[PDB]
UniProtKB/Swiss-Prot annotation, chains A, B:
Family as reported in the entry's similarity comment: Belongs to the AAA ATPase family. CDC48 subfamily.
NCBIfam families according to UniProt: CDC48
InterPro entries: AAA+_ATPase (IPR003593), AAA_ATPase_CDC48 (IPR005938), AAA_ATPase_domain (IPR050168), AAA_lid_3 (IPR041569), Asp_de-COase-like_dom_sf (IPR009010), ATPase_AAA_core (IPR003959), ATPase_AAA_CS (IPR003960), Cdc48_dom2 (IPR004201)
Species lineage: Archaea, Methanobacteriati, Thermoplasmatota, Thermoplasmata, Thermoplasmatales
GO cellular component, one term: cytoplasm
Alphabetically ordered keywords of this record: ATP-binding, Nucleotide-binding, Repeat
Subunit text: Homohexamer. Forms a ring-shaped particle.
Binding residues annotated for ATP, in chain numbering: 231-238, 508-515
Encoding gene (name): vat
Protein's name in the database: VCP-like ATPase
Pfam families cross-referenced by the UniProt entry: AAA (PF00004), AAA_lid_3 (PF17862), CDC48_2 (PF02933), CDC48_N (PF02359)
Keyword field contains Endoplasmic reticulum: no
Positions of disulphide bridges: none
């Protein structure tokens, strides 16, 4: 990694795709170590003396220590993670003409198209080029068209590494050419969109079984056997295992279930045994069984004992290896519930990896992986497409869905462009210029979408703060003491001999904006936001997943610290019946008690219940340890309402035409959720299509005032006041 | 003990690993009978006329006739536990130069002698050594490498024992040490701290077949043929057996069934015959079948000719015993009902053993086995390496989880250490010196885990006494005569005509601390505790474990004297529709009724029911002969409530200005739960919620009065009484 840089620099993976390639991100403080100015061309040289020369370029968030590098340069130079390099300031000259040839292995005799306008011109923008070095220019969504690998057979400035500005003619030969360098179809970690933390968390964790073979194979420590993967597919499960294989240098051997179901009675097992034994003798290699869940579900529900021994044998084949051949059996599955206890015991698989559906941050990264093969990407075209925009329309979808989604974006572009022009056997050059991906390609691609999976609550943080919602400072001032302090002050409550409580219960009028109260304490904690809505219980009540509902806490336990917020969950108790068809409880209700009582009072997880109809609960949540603290949400008052109105209403334009005091007298009946609606509705009455300098007017508030009904009654406020007594 | 507490003694194992491997824990009289006192280095000579020196040490629980000593010195000399030893105090000698060599197997040429400064130079601890001594030092990296073993090839003083002072120079010649040996890495009795009574039983069972100096003619007993193990495997389960072989010095054979079941019809049998034949030349030896579960599962479920011939071959192995050459048969399975009736009966397996799960303690003694190899001799950080603080957190898991947990703990530390430094081919000293353990990594690793516990009940005895909860001296005096006396005075009963009762049923308001009432008498009875409650019972229902309900009594029966406590048995009957799906009855009650009638009270079991509403359920549990005495728990009262509050206030700081009499008299319609929360909620007001350093105040108990509200109504409290009258 780092020698105290300026010569040996730590290599990282580009968080962007970068313009072209040779553009390489460095830090101002790091740029002084090699002593040059941005825009300069520097050459990085390392083991094998395989080289490329790149640009000194901007940082973004970069720590002083890293260098964001594209895997293309790494693949050409074969750079592993955190390698050591020799960099120096080099004088780069002007090219005259460079003779290139496509890779026949990857092409298979397809593209004769003339790329002087497209590939070449793109290559004419400030790209250093090396003779006898294979380099690629991305872009061009698939017609059969990618950034195509071009090895330099000759450069007119013979045996001189040179840079191509915009004058020179790059030479497209199309002549067959063969090299040793690997087909880049074998991927890199960067090719996996995933997430940062997730991919990283999995990266260094999947890094340890190998670590790296080069300087350290095994001296201290030791391998912890195999690995397991969970969850539905991301960009892919086979891709994650394969990306680890390619960069690591170990051979990649795919073992799947259907191959075992193909042949029986020693035909598959001997074939599987041979491939297993062949993997070690051919090591380094990666042994990966995806469908093991299908072959080894065993609760003894399946049949064909001869089939059970086969996988129970593959388990015995693993420990037959000393871990001296440097190969790992990597498992994968959709669910951990399917495992046989044999897979569970250490010595076979002791490692656990959860593949979750990447958040918008991940889908934002997946947009880049696709825009690497196609135009129209953020900063790729000078017109900027902000990645959060496209992510706004992707909900819980994965890479395979985004790919299929982008595949349709291009397919539509194809469906429009090509058929109207049709085409012939030769691929014209013109079609590549006319080809333009449009923001509509996403629109028409979004027209076909669907979730394939069952919902399981996920982490997030809002922007809410105490000021973002007004009123009720008394309960608010208490929430600080309840949640934040046990996290920041675990050692205090020991000296006090006072044992805190796990969680509390918010109860008050229906729909006070109770969700906002959770979001407020959520952002404050700077932790993850987990809210269990009724509909989620409904959805999980249909699939008899009430089991899964307990993993929501388990998930909260592993991702801790987090705040698990239970909304309306109380309804489950009376749902079938309170005492009617069930006495105090269901099998679902006890699950909350199991996880809540089992976990310690002070942990990274914070439990918050919310019920605005608190009596229909069965007593379980009321008893000690079961949500002890009873927190009542009283309705806002004339000052809070005035204070809640002023906060939510000033997020848009405002004018003296409507004032806080006069409207406050008009609302005695509305909670945080209702008040914010009045502000929007009043603005929906006026319009800025016809001239308006403000989004609100007193006449408009009076219109919304008529629409909304002061549903509050001192009667409905009495049940809570009387109920807290009973 | 041993016949002589003087020079001649018996050798016993160190119960705590301790730094004292080179030290020896020595009783106060045993030293006096020998000679001198604490502070003297001693020379020990024993059977085989091999010697070693050590430093003595202070007793705590020791009895004169045992000197608790490490396996290192014994394994170095090669001695087992129970051998006779000649100990004396001698001169403290010193080495001018000393040699040490690593093991070949452990190395495989992986360490060239770097590390001299971090280990040995720091290893000069004034630990008495011997000529050609084999010394073990802890250290290095973890991820699961065990203690670092050295052999002394040379000590510059010619053929004399020495103790290591802190000056001397040291030689590492990169020379051989041993390519073969019985090591501490090869496991020992000490490495497992969970077995206490079980390990004891195995001794008479392994010894006599190994024989031993004490017994040959074998009065009574017999050469037991086989052994069976139970419980989740992988933690000690596989290690226990191979540990009995290493310490017994017998010849060990590990058997893997699926690799035997690999071959069919005559290829497998000869392999089995060879494993058994192999045990004949080594007879007496150790046969261990881990896969017996998979080898003979057949209750008539799975068919085929192979499983009957392989077991029949195993059944043939039971007849092949000459009994003068007797070899041990050990096996591992997750239950007894899994194997086949032929093997269950004597003549093949006459010994069937349950291997349980560790307690917070039991897990703690598994930690020091791991901590032995962990750096940072002691922790001032948060949790001291007196390990009480680390062990108590978890609901608890087996050693494999702790191993993988601490295995990843040192890994989390490595993640912060190594990736920043990385390394080159060599591993210098400073790197090993800089890195040390940190408890936060154990917590970060605690967040990545799984609850290996599936369905089961660990038992214990509580600390609750009658002082923890006061009031109702009549019921307090009643539970004593009902619980204790059946154990203490069953004979007084028969002479005068009364017979030991069956059980009694507690009932009263919810959350009065009724869960503590049983724990209170449980401490007085000094018996084992069992809690039968809904979340646990329903957990059996989810897994259709109802048979296990009977196993709880049977398990409480083998570990008896024990106490079983049934609360929440309410929720059991109605939730299946006591009156809804049947008239009064369900299946689960039959399990309790069947098991309740099947057990008996001379087995050390105390049947205790607890019910909030003794009506809705079946009269069986209510009728006498199942639950005899009926006990109503009335609500706390001022004078008793006062004492209970005095029990709470002595756990936290206190001020004179607060008086428990007045507030207790301001409190009405409350159970013990509200108050134990009250005192806590009050203390929160004074010190932290109001951010001061100060002890509580009367306003705080008044502030809690505003927070707390009546729960139990005086009218229903009368209803419970009238309800009981009927």
């Amino acid at each position: 990694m780092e020698s105290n840089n300026g010569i040996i620099l730590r290599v990282a993976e580009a968080n962007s795709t970068d313009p072209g390639m040779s553009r390489v991100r460095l830090d101002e403080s790091s740029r002084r170590l090699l002593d040059a100015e941005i825009g300069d061309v520097v050459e990085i040289e390392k083991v094998r003396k395989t080289v490329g020369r790149v640009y000194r370029a901007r940082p973004e968030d970069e720590n002083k220590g890293i260098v964001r590098i594209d895997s293309v340069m790494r693949n050409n130079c074969g750079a592993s993670i955190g390698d050591k390099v020799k960099v120096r300031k080099v004088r780069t000259e002007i090219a005259k003409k460079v003779t290139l040839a496509p890779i026949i292995r990857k092409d298979q005799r397809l593209k004769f198209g003339e790329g002087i306008e497209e590939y070449v011109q793109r290559a004419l923008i400030r790209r250093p080029m090396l003779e006898q070095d294979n380099i690629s220019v991305p872009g061009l969504t698939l017609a059969g068209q990618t950034g195509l690998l071009f090895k330099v057979v000759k450069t007119l400035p013979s045996k001189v590494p040179v840079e191509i500005g915009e004058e020179t003619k790059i030479e497209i030969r199309e002549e067959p050419a063969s090299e040793v360098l690997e087909e880049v179809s074998r991927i890199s970690y960067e090719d996996i969109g995933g997430l940062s933390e997730q991919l990283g968390k999995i990266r260094e964790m999947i890094e340890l079984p190998l670590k790296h073979p080069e300087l350290f194979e095994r001296l201290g420590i030791t391998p912890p056997k195999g690995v397991i993967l969970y969850g539905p597919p991301g960009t892919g499960k086979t891709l994650i295992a394969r990306a680890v294989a390619n960069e690591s240098g170990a051979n990649f051997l795919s073992i799947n279930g259907p191959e075992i179901m193909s042949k029986y009675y020693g035909q598959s097992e001997q074939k599987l045994r041979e491939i297993f034994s062949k993997a070690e003798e051919t090591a380094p290699s990666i042994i990966f069984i995806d469908e093991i869940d299908s072959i080894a579900p065993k609760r003894e529900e399946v049949q064909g004992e001869v089939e059970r021994r086969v996988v129970a044998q593959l388990l015995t084949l693993m420990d037959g290896m000393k871990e001296r051949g440097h190969v790992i059996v990597i498992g994968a599955t959709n669910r951990i519930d399917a495992i046989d206890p044999a897979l569970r015991r250490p010595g076979r698989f002791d490692r656990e990896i959860e593949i979750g559906v990447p958040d918008r941050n991940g889908r934002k990264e997946i947009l880049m992986i696709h825009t690497r093969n196609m135009p129209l990407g953020m900063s790729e075209e000078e017109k900027n497409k902000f990645l959060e925009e496209m992510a706004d329309y992707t909900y819980g979808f994965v890479g395979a869905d985004l790919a299929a989604l982008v595949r349709e974006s291009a397919m539509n572009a194809l469906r429009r462009y090509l058929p109207e022009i049709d085409l012939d056997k030769p691929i014209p050059t013109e079609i590549l210029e006319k080809m333009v991906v449009t923001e509509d390609d996403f629109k028409n691609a979004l027209k076909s979408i669907e979730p394939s999976s069952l919902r399981e609550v996920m982490v997030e943080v809002p922007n809410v703060h105490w000021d973002d919602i007004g009123g009720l400072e008394d309960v608010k001032r208490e929430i600080k003491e309840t949640v934040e302090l046990p996290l920041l002050k675990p050692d205090v409550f020991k000296r006090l001999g006072i044992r805190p409580s796990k969680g509390f219960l918010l109860y008050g009028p229906p729909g006070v904006g109770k969700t906002l109260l959770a979001k407020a304490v959520a952002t404050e904690s700077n932790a993850n936001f987990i809210s269990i809505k009724g509909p989620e219980v409904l959805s999980k009540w249909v699939g008899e997943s009430e089991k899964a509902i307990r993993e929501i806490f388990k998930k909260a336990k592993q991702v801790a610290p987090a705040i698990v917020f239970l909304d309306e969950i109380d309804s489950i108790a009376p749902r079938r019946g309170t005492t009617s068809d069930s006495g105090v409880t269901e099998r679902i209700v006890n699950q909350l008690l199991t996880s809540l009582d089992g976990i310690e009072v002070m942990n990274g997880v914070v439990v918050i219940g919310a019920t605005n109809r608190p009596d229909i609960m069965d007593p379980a949540l009321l008893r000690a340890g079961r949500f002890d603290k009873l927190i009542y949400i009283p309705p806002p008052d004339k000052e809070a309402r005035l204070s809640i109105l002023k906060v939510h209403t000033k997020n848009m334009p405002l004018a003296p035409d409507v004032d806080l005091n006069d409207i406050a007298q008009r609302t005695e009946g509305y909670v945080g959720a209702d008040l914010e609606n009045l502000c929007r509705e009043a603005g929906m009455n006026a319009y800025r299509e016809n001239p308006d300098a403000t989004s609100v007017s007193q006449k408009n508030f009076l219109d919304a005032l008529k629409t909304i009904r002061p549903s509050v009654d001192e009667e409905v406020i009495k049940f809570y006041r009387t109920l807290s007594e009973t």
